[PDB]
Amino acid sequence: ITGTSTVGVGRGVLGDQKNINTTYSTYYYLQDNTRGNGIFTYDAKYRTTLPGSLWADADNQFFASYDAPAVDAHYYAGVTYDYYKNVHNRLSYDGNNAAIRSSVHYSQGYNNAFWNGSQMVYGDGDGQTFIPLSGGIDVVAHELTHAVTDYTAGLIYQNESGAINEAISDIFGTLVEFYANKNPDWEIGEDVYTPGISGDSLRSMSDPAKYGDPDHYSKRYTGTQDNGGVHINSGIINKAAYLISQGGTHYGVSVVGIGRDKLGKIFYRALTQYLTPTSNFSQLRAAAVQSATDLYGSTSQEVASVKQAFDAVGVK
Ligand SMILES: [Ca+2]
Ligand SMILES: [Ca+2]
Ligand SMILES: [Ca+2]
Ligand SMILES: [Ca+2]
Ligand SMILES: [Zn+2]
Numbered sequence: 537i538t539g540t541s542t543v544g545v546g547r548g549v550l551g552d553q554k555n556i557n558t559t560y561s562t563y564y565y566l567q568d569n570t571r572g573n574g575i576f577t578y579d580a581k582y583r584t585t586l587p588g589s590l591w592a593d594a595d596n597q598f599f600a601s602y603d604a605p606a607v608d609a610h611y612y613a614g615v616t617y618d619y620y621k622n623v624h625n626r627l628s629y630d631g632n633n634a635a636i637r638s639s640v641h642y643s644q645g646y647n648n649a650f651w652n653g654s655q656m657v658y659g660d661g662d663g664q665t666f667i668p669l670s671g672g673i674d675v676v677a678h679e680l681t682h683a684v685t686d687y688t689a690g691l692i693y694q695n696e697s698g699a700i701n702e703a704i705s706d707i708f709g710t711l712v713e714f715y716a717n718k719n720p721d722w723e724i725g726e727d728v729y730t731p732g733i734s735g736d737s738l739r740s741m742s743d744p745a746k747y748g749d750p751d752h753y754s755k756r757y758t759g760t761q762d763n764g765g766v767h768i769n770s771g772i773i774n775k776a777a778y779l780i781s782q783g784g785t786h787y788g789v790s791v792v793g794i795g796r797d798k799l800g801k802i803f804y805r806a807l808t809q810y811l812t813p814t815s816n817f818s819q820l821r822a823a824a825v826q827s828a829t830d831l832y833g834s835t836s837q838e839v840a841s842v843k844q845a846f847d848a849v850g851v852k
Contacts, residue, residue, distance in 0.1 A: 546598025548608040549671025566591035572633030577610040605640040605668035612676035629683035651682035677712035689811035696816040698766035703773035744771030753850035779845040789848035
C-alpha cells in the first residue's frame, strides 16, 4: 500500500519485545519499506485461502497474543533479508529485490510452515507439537531459503535433490540464527517445537541420529514417504555441513573445522553456481569442492575439509 514508513513495537511468540517496520495509511500495516521492494505480512485468519489480508493495526502497537506470530514472521523475514544482502550480496530471494510475503494464522492447529511457490506460510501449531512456527528464526530463514533455492539451483523436491534442498534450508536457517546471535545452535526449530519438552528440537545438524535421521549415506532412507525422505536424508548433508564448520571425528574420519562463515560462502556458491534441479549427493560434494577451490584454492585447508566431511558421511 502507498503510505509513509513508520516504526511499530510489539511482542513476538516467545514474549520478547521488538521494533517492526510498518506503513501508515489510515491503518498501520505490516509493510516494511526499508528492505528491497518491501516485506509484507498477512493474516490468514485460521483459513487456508492465501495470502489473506495485509496485516492492519489501529495503533502501531502489536502486543496482543493474536499479533505475536505476525510480529515474528515480519521481523525475522527482515533479519533473513539482511543476512542474504550483507553476507552474500543477494537482494531478496530472486536477487532483484522481489517483495517478500508471509501469511500467519494459516489453518487451525497447523503443525508446519512452507513456501507455496510464491510466499511463506506459517501455522500456529496445535500447542503440543508446535507453538506458532514463525517464532523460530531458523524456521523463518528455512522457509525463505526455499525461495532462494527455487530461484537458483531449483532442486527438485524429492529423493536426493530434495534432501539437498532441505539441508540447504536447514544450513542457511542455522546461519541466519547465528547471524542474529540470540541463543544460536545447530538444532532446527527448538524455539517453537514441543513447548512441554525442554531441550529437544525437530532436527539436529550436529547429531541428526538423535531424532532418528541418518548421519551417513549407508543409513539413507530409500522409501517413498516424505517425498523420498527429504526431511530425513537431509541429516546426511546437515551433518557434513556441521563437520565442515565445526570439525569432529565421525565414524573414524576426522574433519578440520573451518568455521561458519566459510561454510556459508562455500554452500552459497555451490547453490548459486553449480547445483542443478537434479543434483544428487555425489554431485553436491563435487559442487562444494569446486566452490571451495574457487574461493580458497585447490591446496587449501578449506578444500581438504570439504572432502573430509563428505568422506565422513559416506558421500563420494
Ligand atoms: Ca495494536
Ligand atoms: Ca536457538
Ligand atoms: Ca536453531
Ligand atoms: Ca521443546
Ligand atoms: Zn523445508
